Design a binder for this molecule. Structure first.
Ligand SMILES: [Mg+2]
Ligand SMILES: [Mg+2]
Ligand SMILES: [Mg+2]
Ligand SMILES: [Mg+2]
Ligand SMILES: [Mg+2]
Ligand SMILES: [Mg+2]
Ligand SMILES: [Mg+2]
Ligand SMILES: [Mg+2]
Ligand SMILES: [Mg+2]
Ligand SMILES: [Mg+2]
Ligand SMILES: [Mg+2]
Ligand SMILES: [Mg+2]
Ligand SMILES: [Mg+2]
Ligand SMILES: [Mg+2]
Ligand SMILES: [Mg+2]
Lengths: 68, 195, 81, 224, 95, 118, 129
RNA sequence: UCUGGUGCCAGCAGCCGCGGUAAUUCCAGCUCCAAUAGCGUAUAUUAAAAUUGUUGCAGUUAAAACGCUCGUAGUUGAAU
RNA sequence: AAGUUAAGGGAGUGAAGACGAUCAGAUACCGUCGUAAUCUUAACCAUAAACUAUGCCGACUAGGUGUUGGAUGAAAGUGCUUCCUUCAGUACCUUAUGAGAAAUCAAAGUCUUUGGGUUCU
């Protein structure tokens, strides 16, 4: 059986899923068999980009407050 | 007072309809030959005065909500909230305002005025969840569930709604020291009329 | 209740409906309290008021208006019941 | 705590404007935040703190197209040991979040319980003031007053709930399908709730009305 | 179970009601339970109707109609879509 | 199809709601405003948001737009609709009532002078 | 047919009291109903009541104080000895400190405490909380 | 959820169930629990059973209103 | 309703029976014939989802819309209709700090706050 633990926000599709997500896989050998360990960590959204520069916002289109 | 009844006679506040709805029998004077029920108009004035006293007893006017659902009652409710210090809704009611604390427009009052209990039924339904003294403005076929003080009127005429709200506001101003009696209110009806 | 030493042993005393004497409990949310302002022979509202309590039962049955009318007519606030 | 009140009652309780929870039981006001109950029952400056007990966890299934779909329900009973009681329930995907939700729900439903005497009145009432009956589903329960030394004569769940409520002596009998744990807990809770509604002869005299906290603290609450 | 208050027909204050026979399948059905349809139809359609007008004497002719008054059993009626299957709350909607 | 998701419509309504004065009925002019006002990584959605904003303005000329609230329209409408008549219509020199209603006022013992029926 | 007037009277009183009616009418009256009403009046459970005179069995109008929980008869009038009161009151009454069980006794109609005070038994009539 | 043996066999199990090569339930070793000079098993009987109901059941659809009316015994009968 | 006895009657329909089709088979569904029966008079039999699957008598508790049969009181009439009130049948709609396991119920409500009278299971 497989057990899934999640917390927060994650992305699965597209190019941003390859940049902003970190992945690792390992296995542990018990006396009854072998167990698979899979970890996926979504980094803080900076992930330096094609033009070497931090892409702080992947898709958000925030609007600036007009100067008083 | 004579002239208030005169103005109520000029407008059509005294004509109801069929569907007597027996809990409203004691406010109806008679039935005409075409089947229309007539409202006494001597009890309307007295109930209006008592309603004004109940309203003025509130400490800050912001703890009062006045609601209208129909298009030709929006001007009257907005003006009444302007000259008093209450809050108005005037249209579509969000079904969780009085009972859902996480929502954006919680706005829990201490008293609530209704234009018509048959169309503002969601508002009166939610009042009984938070101990709110509903006061309404009932026609000859209105339901009286969860209604405490009922003013006999007709909810259908634009002139009727404008006149009744104007009278209530003027009386509220008299009970405060803003202007004394024997001097009429300087603002005029047709400021509360629709369109 | 008082014990044998005349010490009150209730944690609180609930209210009663003015129309039926019905002893409103702590979760009844259809119960309301009304304050009616007073005038001072000149038509302006002084600091005084009168209080009534109405239970959720009669308020759900749709009879709060008639009971309130009678209760106010007793207190010299109306001319009919 | 460092929590931001959302309702007027929360703002009033956050400051010392309300002295005891009985002040809001009297006016029949709703309670929407568990921080009020947390504030009124603190481990210090309180003789009797609240206690919890997860009485039951059961799984339920929905059985969609690709196999079943399980999730768990939690029943928790909270009690003061002196005059206060509550009961809550919650369903969720994991047991821990379910018990968290159930604990929150139990606090929000806290009620007072009236206690009385068998025979002559002496210090510290110990039993129910009169016979009470509770009902949920097909389950019916009845509780009757008992003398000083007789402990609770009832099923384990009845003993548990009456121990949270602060009652020391009672006879009981039940009818229906009591193996349904939730309905039987709810029936006991319903019977306990009815004590402060009976109008015994000593409650006949009329008293005048105190004024609501909203009216009393109108100016301070308007200052915000 | 007990999916209808009237039991599928309109009978009150009576013991027995005589039956009639289905217009399509010949079955016996009590009169108070069959669905009744009264149809006023034309002898011919609107195109062949104006051919009869201009081949006619009297210069002002009105073709007669037909009166049928058909009756059906439940099975022979809902297969021909005179009556459909409805939802639980809509089942109570008469006229 | 070319239906615009809520990402486009949310942002575009904010631009109209906050910078009403600068925006006009030309797509190119409205495009340069959006480039520096907002933050959009890709030029394809920069074009689409600006195109929607221009489409919004044309609708404004025919009146209010449901879901967009710019203050300048309400105060200009408020002054129009407060138009006081030079004399009310509440007053009529003769009160006209129904025959059955006339008895109602008479039974109560109150006097209103110019009352006549039909 | 009737077969009893006391049961109907108490049932009507109980039904009116659950609704908050402030007044109710009892169509057939009798001396037993009068004694039972007087006893409820003595313990402060109802207000005054009026007896109407038609030239048939009279009628009664009573004033209610929103104060009765229950009032019912025990139809077979079992006879009770002086030392069997305890079991009956344990079964029938809601507490040991309020409520009344009414007997008819060779010294008149009285509740169980007065019956013990007078050292007598009787037959059972009804009760009221 | 300790260690060996067996492998839908042998067996256990009042009821639900366990056992088909990694058995917390069979056969054993160790360790723990219960009552204790006492502790198991079989049959009968009481409470549990408001599952025989006077206190105190149920009868539209779960078991259950006679096809319908008259009628003797029995039971029950207005107010003074 | 079916079924039995006797005397009549006997068009249509038609358990049985005989054919023609479909089918792997078809002693069935479809079609062509057709005996008892179905109808009347005089006698038996005592059963049905003989169903509102809710025994009978009495009291109390809520608003509205109809309809069948009387009676009272008022208006449009060519001692007649429309309206109002009331009694007796009979349905439907809304809602129940009423009830149920629910479906739902104006009784299937006034039940651990348990007893109006009575028969059957
Ligand atoms: Mg894509
Ligand atoms: Mg039949
Ligand atoms: Mg072992
Ligand atoms: Mg036994
Ligand atoms: Mg037994
Ligand atoms: Mg027992
Ligand atoms: Mg049973
Ligand atoms: Mg029957
Ligand atoms: Mg023959
Ligand atoms: Mg023949
Ligand atoms: Mg033939
Ligand atoms: Mg024959
Ligand atoms: Mg039979
Ligand atoms: Mg039967
Ligand atoms: Mg019983």
């Amino acid at each position: 059986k497989s057990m899934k633990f999640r917390d927060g926000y994650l992305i699965s599709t597209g190019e941003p899923s390859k940049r902003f997500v970190n992945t690792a896989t390992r296995s542990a050998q018990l006396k009854q068999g072998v167990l698979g360990i899979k970890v996926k960590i979504m980094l803080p959204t900076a992930i330096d980009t094609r033009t070497g520069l931090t892409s702080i916002l992947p898709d958000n289109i925030s609007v600036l407050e007009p100067k008083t | 007072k004579e002239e208030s009844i005169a103005k109520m006679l000029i407008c059509k506040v005294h004509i109801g309809t069929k569907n007597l709805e027996n809990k409203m029998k004691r406010y109806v004077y008679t039935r005409a030959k075409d089947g229309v029920h007539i409202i006494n108009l001597a009890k309307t004035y007295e109930k209006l005065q008592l309603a004004a006293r109940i309203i003025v007893a509130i400490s800050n006017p912001a703890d009062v909500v006045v609601v209208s659902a129909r298009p030709f009652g929006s001007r009257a409710v907005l003006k009444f909230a302007q000259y008093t210090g209450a809050q108005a809704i005037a249209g579509r009611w969000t079904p969780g305002m009085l009972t859902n604390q996480i929502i954006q427009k919680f706005t829990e009052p201490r008293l609530l005025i209704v234009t018509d209990p048959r169309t503002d039924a969601q508002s009166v339904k939610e009042s009984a969840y938070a101990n709110i003294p509903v006061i309404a403005l009932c026609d000859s076929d209105s339901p009286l569930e969860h209604v405490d003080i009922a003013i006999p009127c007709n909810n259908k005429g634009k002139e009727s709604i404008a006149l009744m709200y104007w009278l209530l506001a003027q009386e509220v101003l008299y009970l405060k020291g803003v202007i004394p009696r024997s001097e009429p209110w300087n603002v005029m009806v047709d400021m509360f009329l629709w369109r | 209740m008082f014990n044998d030493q005349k010490v009150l042993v209730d944690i609180y005393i609930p209210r009663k409906c003015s129309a039926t004497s019905r002893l409103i409990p702590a979760k009844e949310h259809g119960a309301v309290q009304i304050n009616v302002g007073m005038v001072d022979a000149n038509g302006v509202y002084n600091g005084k008021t009168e209080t009534f309590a109405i239970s959720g039962h009669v308020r759900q049955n749709g009879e709060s208006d008639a009971c309130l009318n009678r209760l106010m007519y007793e207190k010299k606030l109306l001319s009919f019941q | 705590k460092n929590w931001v009140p959302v309702t007027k009652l929360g703002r009033l309780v956050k400051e010392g404007k309300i002295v005891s929870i009985e002040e809001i039981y009297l006016h029949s006001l709703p309670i929407k935040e568990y921080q009020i109950i947390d504030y009124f029952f603190q481990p210090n400056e309180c003789s009797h703190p609240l206690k919890d007990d997860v009485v039951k966890i059961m799984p339920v299934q929905k059985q969609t197209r690709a196999g079943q779909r399980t999730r768990f329900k939690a029943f928790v009973a909270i009690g003061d040991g002196n005059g206060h009681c509550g009961l809550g329930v919650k369903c969720a995907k994991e047991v821990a979040t379910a018990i968290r939700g159930a604990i929150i729900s139990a606090k929000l439903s806290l009620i007072p319980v009236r206690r009385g005497y068998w025979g002559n009145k002496i210090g510290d009432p110990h039993t129910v003031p009169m016979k009470v009956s509770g009902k949920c589903g097909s389950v019916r329960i009845r509780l009757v007053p008992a003398p000083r030394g007789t402990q609770i004569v009832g099923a384990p769940t009845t003993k548990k709930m009456l121990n949270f409520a602060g009652i020391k002596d009672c006879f009981s009998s039940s009818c229906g399908k009591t193996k349904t744990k939730g309905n039987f807990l709810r029936a006991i809770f319903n019977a306990l709730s009815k004590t402060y509604g009976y109008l015994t002869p000593d409650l006949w005299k009329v008293t005048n009305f105190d004024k609501s906290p909203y009216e009393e603290w109108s100016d301070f609450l308007e200052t915000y | 179970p007990k999916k209808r208050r009237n039991g599928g027909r309109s009978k009150h204050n009576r013991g027995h009601v005589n039956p009639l026979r289905c217009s399509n399948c010949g079955r016996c059905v009590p009169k108070d339970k069959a669905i009744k349809r009264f149809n006023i139809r034309n002898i011919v359609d609107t195109s062949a109707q104006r051919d009869i007008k201009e081949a006619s004497v009297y210069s002002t002719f009105q073709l007669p109609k037909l009166y049928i008054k058909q009756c059906y059993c439940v099975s022979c009626a809902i297969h021909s879509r005179f009556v459909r299957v409805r939802s639980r709350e809509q089942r109570r909607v008469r006229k | 199809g070319r239906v615009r998701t809520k990402t486009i419509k949310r942002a575009a309504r904010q631009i109209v709601e906050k910078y009403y004065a600068k925006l006009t009925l030309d797509f190119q002019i409205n495009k340069k405003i959006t480039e520096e006002v907002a933050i959009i990584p890709s030029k394809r959605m920069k074009n689409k948001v600006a195109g929607f904003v221009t489409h919004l303005m044309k609708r404004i000329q025919k009146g209010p737009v449901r879901g967009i609230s710019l203050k300048l329209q309400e105060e200009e409408r408020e002054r129009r609709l407060d138009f006081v008549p030079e004399k009310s219509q509440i007053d009529v020199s003769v009160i006209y009532v129904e025959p059955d209603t006339l008895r109602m006022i008479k039974s109560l013992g109150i006097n209103i002078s110019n009352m006549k029926v039909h | 047919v009737r077969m009893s007037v006391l049961a109907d009277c108490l049932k009507t009183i109980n039904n009116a009291e659950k609704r908050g009616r402030r007044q109710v009418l009892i169509r057939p009256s009798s001396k037993v109903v009068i004694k039972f009403l007087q006893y409820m009046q003595k313990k402060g459970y109802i207000g005054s009541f009026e007896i109407v005179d038609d030239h048939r069995s009279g009628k009664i109008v009573v004033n209610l104080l929103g104060r009765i929980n229950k009032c019912a008869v025990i139809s077979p009038r079992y006879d009770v000895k002086l030392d069997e009161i305890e079991k009956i009151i344990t079964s029938i009454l809601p507490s040991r400190l309020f409520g009344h069980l009414i007997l008819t006794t060779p010294y008149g109609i009285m509740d169980h405490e007065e019956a013990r005070r007078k050292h007598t038994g009787g037959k059972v009539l009804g009760f009221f909380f």
